[PDB]
Amino acid sequence: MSMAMSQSNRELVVDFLSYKLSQKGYSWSQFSDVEENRTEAPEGTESEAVKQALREAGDEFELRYRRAFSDLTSQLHITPGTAYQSFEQVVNELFRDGVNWGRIVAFFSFGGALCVESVDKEMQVLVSRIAAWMATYLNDHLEPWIQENGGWDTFVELYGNNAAAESRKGQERLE
């Protein structure tokens, strides 16, 4: 079962999403059912390390240009049933010709800020709906490449703390 891999991405997307609500002080457990830490694991904690991995890199993106991570509902029409139009579009020009772990991490954070934006306008129906879209995107679209690249596990190794670290060390500047 290859599609099963989603099991890790599902919580990935649900976890990351919640991580975003935290910044805005949003009860992520009032939309889906984010019980708590520890979500299945028959080997060790792959998905766990995978989640954090995306969190780190995702921080690098937001820190780079939070501008893009601003009010998105004010620009386009975000409503239950129309949100699909946007996603399909954004996702199109986003992963048109190229994916890589890079676009992946940014993709997770993408829906993150977009979620808090919707819920803020009394529109949570798009929240969960988006979370599933982000995950299924892999099982449906971002799949053959995920494995070919070396499986979600490979991602962890490539963009692991070691990766995001170097970049932050040679980009953040610090001074």
Binding site: E60, V90, R96, G102
Partner: peptide
């Protein structure tokens, strides 16, 4: 009409290209 999504993704794409460079290879 949809100004964001379309452009929204485009802008995000650029940052992506730069987002990665050392990790890969």
């Amino acid at each position: 009409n949809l100004w964001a999504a379309q452009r929204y993704g485009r802008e995000l794409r650029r940052m992506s290209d730069e987002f990665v460079d050392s990790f890969k290879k």
